[PDB]
Design a protein around this motif. Structure first.
Motif, PDB file in Angstrom:
ATOM      1  N   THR A  37       1.570 -10.772  -7.658  1.00 41.91           N
ATOM      2  CA  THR A  37       0.731  -9.594  -7.839  1.00 41.91           C
ATOM      3  C   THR A  37       1.041  -8.605  -6.723  1.00 41.91           C
ATOM      4  N   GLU A  38       0.424  -7.428  -6.811  1.00 46.38           N
ATOM      5  CA  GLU A  38       0.536  -6.392  -5.794  1.00 46.38           C
ATOM      6  C   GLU A  38      -0.862  -5.964  -5.374  1.00 46.38           C
ATOM      7  N   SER A  39      -1.066  -5.808  -4.065  1.00 48.15           N
ATOM      8  CA  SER A  39      -2.362  -5.409  -3.506  1.00 48.15           C
ATOM      9  C   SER A  39      -2.121  -4.312  -2.472  1.00 48.15           C
ATOM     10  N   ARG A  40      -2.035  -3.073  -2.945  1.00 46.22           N
ATOM     11  CA  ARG A  40      -1.851  -1.924  -2.076  1.00 46.22           C
ATOM     12  C   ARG A  40      -3.195  -1.432  -1.550  1.00 46.22           C
ATOM     13  N   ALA A  41      -3.131  -0.525  -0.578  1.00 38.57           N
ATOM     14  CA  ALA A  41      -4.335   0.128  -0.088  1.00 38.57           C
ATOM     15  C   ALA A  41      -4.983   0.918  -1.217  1.00 38.57           C
ATOM     16  N   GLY A  42      -6.226   0.574  -1.536  1.00 35.86           N
ATOM     17  CA  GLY A  42      -6.955   1.175  -2.637  1.00 35.86           C
ATOM     18  C   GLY A  42      -7.336   0.205  -3.735  1.00 35.86           C
ATOM     19  N   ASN A  43      -6.647  -0.931  -3.842  1.00 32.33           N
ATOM     20  CA  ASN A  43      -7.023  -1.943  -4.816  1.00 32.33           C
ATOM     21  C   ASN A  43      -8.353  -2.581  -4.439  1.00 32.33           C
ATOM     22  N   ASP A  44      -9.058  -3.081  -5.450  1.00 29.16           N
ATOM     23  CA  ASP A  44     -10.358  -3.702  -5.236  1.00 29.16           C
ATOM     24  C   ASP A  44     -10.264  -5.100  -4.636  1.00 29.16           C
ATOM     25  N   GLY A  45      -9.064  -5.668  -4.526  1.00 22.22           N
ATOM     26  CA  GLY A  45      -8.892  -6.991  -3.967  1.00 22.22           C
ATOM     27  C   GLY A  45      -9.232  -8.137  -4.894  1.00 22.22           C
ATOM     28  N   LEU A  46      -9.850  -7.867  -6.044  1.00 22.49           N
ATOM     29  CA  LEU A  46     -10.180  -8.912  -7.015  1.00 22.49           C
ATOM     30  C   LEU A  46      -9.046  -9.031  -8.034  1.00 22.49           C
ATOM     31  N   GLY A  47      -7.895  -9.466  -7.529  1.00 16.91           N
ATOM     32  CA  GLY A  47      -6.725  -9.647  -8.364  1.00 16.91           C
ATOM     33  C   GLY A  47      -6.404 -11.104  -8.616  1.00 16.91           C
ATOM     34  N   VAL A  48      -5.125 -11.441  -8.608  1.00 21.12           N
ATOM     35  CA  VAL A  48      -4.676 -12.804  -8.859  1.00 21.12           C
ATOM     36  C   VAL A  48      -4.645 -13.569  -7.543  1.00 21.12           C
ATOM     37  N   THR A  49      -5.062 -14.830  -7.591  1.00 22.21           N
ATOM     38  CA  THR A  49      -5.014 -15.686  -6.413  1.00 22.21           C
ATOM     39  C   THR A  49      -3.570 -16.040  -6.080  1.00 22.21           C
TER      40      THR A  49
ATOM     41  N   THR B 295      -4.596  10.896   3.848  1.00 25.55           N
ATOM     42  CA  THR B 295      -3.979  10.230   2.714  1.00 25.55           C
ATOM     43  C   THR B 295      -4.458   8.787   2.647  1.00 25.55           C
ATOM     44  N   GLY B 296      -4.570   8.272   1.424  1.00 25.28           N
ATOM     45  CA  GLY B 296      -4.995   6.902   1.224  1.00 25.28           C
ATOM     46  C   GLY B 296      -5.887   6.714   0.016  1.00 25.28           C
ATOM     47  N   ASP B 297      -5.467   5.845  -0.908  1.00 20.10           N
ATOM     48  CA  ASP B 297      -6.276   5.549  -2.084  1.00 20.10           C
ATOM     49  C   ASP B 297      -7.550   4.793  -1.735  1.00 20.10           C
TER      50      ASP B 297
ATOM     51  N   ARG C  83       4.263   3.512  -1.234  1.00 24.29           N
ATOM     52  CA  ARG C  83       3.451   4.642  -1.664  1.00 24.29           C
ATOM     53  C   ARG C  83       3.217   5.636  -0.532  1.00 24.29           C
ATOM     54  N   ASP C  84       4.070   5.621   0.491  1.00 28.04           N
ATOM     55  CA  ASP C  84       3.972   6.544   1.621  1.00 28.04           C
ATOM     56  C   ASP C  84       4.877   7.736   1.336  1.00 28.04           C
TER      57      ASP C  84
ATOM     58  N   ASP D 185      -2.661   8.626  -2.651  1.00 29.49           N
ATOM     59  CA  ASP D 185      -1.258   8.244  -2.477  1.00 29.49           C
ATOM     60  C   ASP D 185      -0.485   8.550  -3.761  1.00 29.49           C
ATOM     61  N   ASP D 186      -0.320   9.847  -4.014  1.00 29.58           N
ATOM     62  CA  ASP D 186       0.394  10.341  -5.183  1.00 29.58           C
ATOM     63  C   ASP D 186       1.451  11.331  -4.725  1.00 29.58           C
ATOM     64  N   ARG D 187       2.681  11.149  -5.209  1.00 24.86           N
ATOM     65  CA  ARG D 187       3.789  12.000  -4.785  1.00 24.86           C
ATOM     66  C   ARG D 187       3.552  13.455  -5.173  1.00 24.86           C
TER      67      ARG D 187
END
Ligand code: MG
Ligand code: MG
Ligand code: MG
Lengths: 419, 419
Positions: free
Chosen positions: A71-83, B182-184, B257-258, B226-228
Motif C-alpha cells: 500500500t501507499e501512505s502519503r501525507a494526507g492519508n487517513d492511515g486506515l489502510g492495509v496492514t 503545502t501539504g494534503d 508528491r513534492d 500536493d498537486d502539481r
C-alpha cells in the motif's frame, strides 16, 4: 538636592505602573504581546504515527531484501489502510501516517525500485524498530502546556498557537499613549521658512515614532502653546480619552510659563519632578485618576530638550510601557563594554552618554565583546548625539576621564544588528 | 554531497538579492526604513541665539549687581525687541531669543528679584560671555547633512527629519512577501477536532508573524494541496501579483508528491536545493522573472518541518529582506557566549542549536558576557525547540561534546532584552 537618583525614580515609576487588564485578540494581533493565559494542546503532535523521512514503512525484523509495496501512505492519508504484514512494505512520505504493522521507516536513499508495470522495492539496510517514525505526541503531548502566562509572543509562539488551534488569544494589551508638545516657539514640521524665533516641533514626531517602535497606539494631541488654560484643557481631554500614558514635551523647567509641572500637581499626584542625571534634570511623573469605568493614567512630563526628551523616554517610559503590557522583565538590556575613545564623566551628575556599540571578535583586550564609540558632543539640545545611537553609557559621577579600553555599563536602547 | 555549505548558500542569495527601487513615503511611514537620500538642514538649529537656561540675559562685563529688567524674551518671541544696553538685563526662558546686546545668560537660581510693583533683579554671580547661550547653528548648521543615504530611520532620525522639515522622505521600501503552505495533511488553525491524518497549518501563521516582525507586507496565499497543477497556478498568481519574495513551506523533500522544487526549476533559475546544515537539509532558492514593468521575484522553497522552516527563515530570508530593504549590514548579529550545559554536536552537519541567551555579570569565568541555555531536543519537527529561543548556536560538525563553559558562536535572531 531635591532631585532623586535615577535608580529611585525608576523604583517609584515601577511601583505605580500597573499591568493593564487582559483582552482577547486574534492570532495576528497577538504578535509581540504578552500571553495572559496558559495554552494547552487539545490534541497531540503528531496525532498519528507520522513518517520522518520519505521512503518505505517496513517491519524492522524482516531486514534487507525485496518486498512488495502492499500500500501507499502519503501525507494526507487517513492511515486506515492495509496492514503491513511481515514481508511487505508501504511507501510513505514525510508526514505520512505509518500503516498498522510497520515498526520502522527506511529512507528512500536506502531503497531501490525493482521491476516495473504490482510494485516491488528492495530494502538495502537493516533498520531497528522505531527509526524515522514520529510517535503520537513525540513533539507535543496532548493537554501539555505549550505556552505559559507571561511569555511574550513571537513568530515561534504564533506557530505553537496555530498548532494548538488557538486563533483567539488572551493577552495583555499595549498601553494607549497620548503625546503633545509645548512651546510658543514650536511650529509644525511641515513649515518651510521659519519665522523669527520659531523652531520646528521635533519631539512630538520623535516621541510618536518612539512609541510606535513600542507597538503602542499613539494619540497625537499636537502642539500646545505655553498657556495655563490651554494645557489644562488638553490634559483633561487626554485623561478622559481613555489613554494609559500621557507624554508631554517641555513646560517642566524653571520658566515662568512652564505650566506642565504645576498642572500635573493639580490634577494628579506628582511623585517627582527633578532627577539627578545627565542629560537634563527636569522630569515630572504623575499619576492621574480618570473621573468617570474608573481608570488610572500615568503622566510623563518629559523635558523639552530633544536629547533629554528621548533619553528620558528610553529609561523611564519604555519600562513603563512594557510593565503595563505585562512584561515580566520590563528593564532594558544592560551589558558591559569597552570604550573606543576617552570620555570625560561629569563630576556631579551620572551621565547617560549616547554611543554606537558593536560586537567585535577582539574588543581591544584579546577577547570578543562589545565596544562603544561616542556620538560626539552630548549637549541636551544636540539631537545629533542621538543619531544612530543604540546604547546609553552609564557613566558614574566621578569627574575622572575614563580612558579608551576601560569597561562601563551600557543600556541598549535598540537592536544592535549592525555588524 | 550535492548540498552546499551555509556560507555558500548565503553568498549565492546575497549575490542574487537586489535592492528595491526607492519610493517616497510620509514621515511616519519612513520609520524603520532605510534612507535613500541625504537630508540637509534648510535652516540652522537654533535659527536664532537661544537661551539654554531660564533666567536673565545679561552683559557679561557688567558682572554681579542690581539691574533693571529692560525687556522680556521668552520662548516664542520674535527676538526683535529692546536692545539690552550695559547695565540692563532681560528675562529669558529656555529657547527664548537672546536680545541684541546680551553676551551671556545667568541661571535664575543665581538671581534674586528685588522690589515689586518697573522690575529689578540682582545678578548674584560673575558670568563669562557666551554662557548658557545656544549660538546660531550650534546644534545643527545650515545646509549640513543631518542624515545620509543608507542610514536606517529610528526615533531619533524621525526627530531630525522633523527638525529639517522633511515630511516626505525618499526611502527604500520593504519587500512584499507572499507566503503559502503545502501539504494534503494540512488544515486551517481554526480547525477543532482533527481528522485522520490531519495536522493544523502552523508554518504559514508562523511565517506570517515572522515576516510581520520584519515590517513587510504579507500576501497570505493559504494552504495549497500536493498537486502539481495547483501549486503551478498559485505560483503564477504569486509571481504576477507584484510580490518581491515568495515563501513556500514544504514540498521540497524526497517524496513523489513534492512539486515545489521541480516547479521552481521550471519557472525560474534554482541556484540550490540542498544545504549542509542541521536542522533540515532541503532548501530551494530560485530567481523568477515576472513576465509583463519587468520584475524579479525571489522564491524560497522552505522545508515543511516547523523548526527547519523557521531556522531557514532566520538565516536566509531575513538577510534577503534587509538587503532588498536597502540595509548596508543585512547580516544578523553574531556574538560569542559560554555554554550553560554540555551539548553534543553533529559529526556531519554543522548545527544551528536553538538557545535562550542572556547577559550575566559573571558568564561563568569571572567576566561579564553572554551565556546560553539549550531549548531541549533539537528535532526538526519539535517546534517547542524554537519556543522563546533568541539565538542560534553555530556548532561545528566535529561530533565532540562541547562541555559547559566552552565558547561558541551564536546568531541572535531577536532582541534579547530579557534581563
Ligand atoms: Mg518651553
Ligand atoms: Mg509534505
Ligand atoms: Mg540585541
Amino acid at each position: 538636592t531635591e532631585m532623586i537618583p535615577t535608580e529611585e525614580a525608576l523604583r517609584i515609576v515601577f511601583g505605580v505602573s500597573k499591568r493593564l487588564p487582559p483582552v482577547i485578540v486574534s492570532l495576528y494581533e497577538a504578535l509581540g504581546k504578552v500571553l495572559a493565559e496558559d495554552i494547552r494542546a487539545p490534541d497531540p503532535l503528531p496525532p498519528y504515527p507520522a513518517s520522518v523521512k520519505d521512503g518505505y514503512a517496513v517491519v524492522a525484523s524482516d531486514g534487507p531484501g525485496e518486498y512488495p509495496v502492499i500500500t501507499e501512505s502519503r501525507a494526507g492519508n487517513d492511515g486506515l489502510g492495509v496492514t503491513v504484514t511481515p514481508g511487505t512494505v508501504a511507501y510513505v512520505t514525510t508526514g505520512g501516517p505509518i500503516p498498522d504493522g510497520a515498526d520502522a521507516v527506511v529512507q528512500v536513499e536506502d531503497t531501490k525500485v525493482i521491476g516495473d508495470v504490482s510494485k516491488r522495492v528492495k530494502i538495502l539496510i537493516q533498520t531497528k524498530k522505531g527509526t524515522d517514525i514520529r510517535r503520537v505526541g513525540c513533539d507535543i503531548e496532548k493537554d501539555a502546556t505549550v505556552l505559559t502566562t507571561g511569555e511574550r509572543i513571537g513568530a515561534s509562539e504564533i506557530g505553537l498557537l496555530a498548532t494548538a488551534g488557538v486563533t483567539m488569544v488572551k493577552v495583555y494589551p499595549m498601553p494607549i499613549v497620548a503625546i503633545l508638545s509645548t512651546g510658543d516657539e514650536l511650529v509644525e514640521p511641515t513649515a518651510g521658512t521659519l519665522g523669527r524665533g520659531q523652531i520646528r516641533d521635533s519631539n512630538r514626531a520623535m516621541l510618536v515614532a518612539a512609541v510606535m517602535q513600542q507597538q503602542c497606539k499613539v494619540v497625537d494631541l499636537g502642539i500646545v502653546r505655553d498657556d495655563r488654560k490651554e494645557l489644562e484643557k488638553v490634559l483633561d481631554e487626554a485623561v478622559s480619552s481613555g489613554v494609559d500614558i500621557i507624554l508631554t514635551s517641555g513646560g517642566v523647567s524653571m520658566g515662568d510659563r512652564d505650566f506642565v509641572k504645576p498642572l500635573l500637581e493639580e490634577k494628579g499626584k506628582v511623585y517627582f519632578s527633578k532627577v539627578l542625571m545627565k542629560p537634563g534634570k527636569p522630569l515630572t511623573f504623575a499619576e492621574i485618576r480618570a473621573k468617570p469605568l474608573g481608570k488610572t493614567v500615568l503622566a510623563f512630563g518629559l523635558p523639552g530638550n530633544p536629547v533629554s526628551c528621548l533619553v528620558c523616554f528610553n529609561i523611564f517610559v519604555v519600562p513603563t510601557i512594557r510593565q503595563l503590557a505585562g512584561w515580566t522583565s520590563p528593564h532594558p538590556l544592560r551589558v558591559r563594554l569597552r570604550l573606543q575613545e576617552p570620555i570625560k564623566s561629569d563630576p556631579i551628575r551620572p551621565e547617560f552618554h549616547r554611543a554606537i556599540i558593536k560586537w567585535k571578535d577582539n574588543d581591544g583586550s584579546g577577547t570578543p565583546g562589545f565596544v562603544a564609540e561616542s556620538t560626539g558632543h552630548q549637549m541636551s539640545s544636540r539631537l545629533l548625539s542621538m543619531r544612530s545611537a543604540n546604547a546609553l553609557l552609564e557613566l558614574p559621577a566621578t569627574g575622572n576621564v575614563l580612558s579608551a579600553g576601560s569597561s562601563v555599563s551600557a543600556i541598549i536602547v535598540s537592536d544592535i544588528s549592525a555588524f
